[PDB]
Amino acid sequence: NQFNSAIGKIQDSLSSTPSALGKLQDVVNQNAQALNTLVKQLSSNFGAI
């Protein structure tokens, strides 16, 4: 009974409560944002005309 119930509680927590995958999200963010930088750097003048 008990281990079923715990599985169900994991089921609600991952279904409704957000921010449960913060680690994986953070990794994806931090990569995507390094790219958006490096792109956004690609349009700098660095002293040129």
Partner 1 sequence: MTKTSVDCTMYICGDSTECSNLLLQYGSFCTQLNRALTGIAVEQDKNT
What φ, ψ does residue 31 adopt, rounded to 5°? -65, -55
How far apart CA 49 and CA 6 sit, in angstroms, is 64
CB of 41 to partner 1, least distance (A): 5
Binders of partner 1 among residues 1 to 49 (CB under 8 A) are 37, 40-41, 44-47
Cβ proximity to partner 1, 13 vs 33, nearer residue: 33
Assess contact for 14 and 20: CB atoms under 8 A: yes
Cβ proximity to partner 1, 3 vs 46, nearer residue: 46
Q: List contacts with partner 1 (CB under 8 A).
A: 37, 40-41, 44-47
